[PDB]
Amino acid sequence: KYLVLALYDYQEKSPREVTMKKGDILTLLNSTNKDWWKVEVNGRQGFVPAAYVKYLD
């Protein structure tokens, strides 16, 4: 179970990004990069800013 909470809305601005809404619980796919985390939201995968999510533990 690897979940993150969206702390802010984020609208995708480049091809491999995804959009999320504040309060969404996203599945974390890859957190190897310090700035951009790969997540799954609404049937879609892609990157959001690491700073805009909180790892749930």
UniProtKB/Swiss-Prot annotation:
<comment type="subunit">
    <text>Like erythrocyte spectrin, the spectrin-like proteins are capable of forming dimers which can further associate to tetramers. Interacts (via C-terminal spectrin repeats) with TRPC4. Interacts with CALM and EMD. Interacts with isoform 1 of ACP1. Identified in a complex with ACTN4, CASK, IQGAP1, MAGI2, NPHS1 and SPTBN1. Interacts with SHANK3 (via ANK repeats). Interacts with CLN3; this interaction regulates the fodrin localization at the plasma membrane.</text>
</comment>
<comment type="function">
    <text>Fodrin, which seems to be involved in secretion, interacts with calmodulin in a calcium-dependent manner and is thus candidate for the calcium-dependent movement of the cytoskeleton at the membrane.</text>
</comment>
<protein>
    <recommendedName>
        <fullName>Spectrin alpha chain, non-erythrocytic 1</fullName>
    </recommendedName>
</protein>
<feature type="modified residue" description="Phosphoserine">
    <location>
        <position position="14"/>
    </location>
</feature>
<feature type="modified residue" description="Phosphoserine">
    <location>
        <position position="31"/>
    </location>
</feature>
<comment type="similarity">
    <text>Belongs to the spectrin family.</text>
</comment>
<feature type="domain" description="SH3">
    <location>
        <begin position="1"/>
        <end position="57"/>
    </location>
</feature>
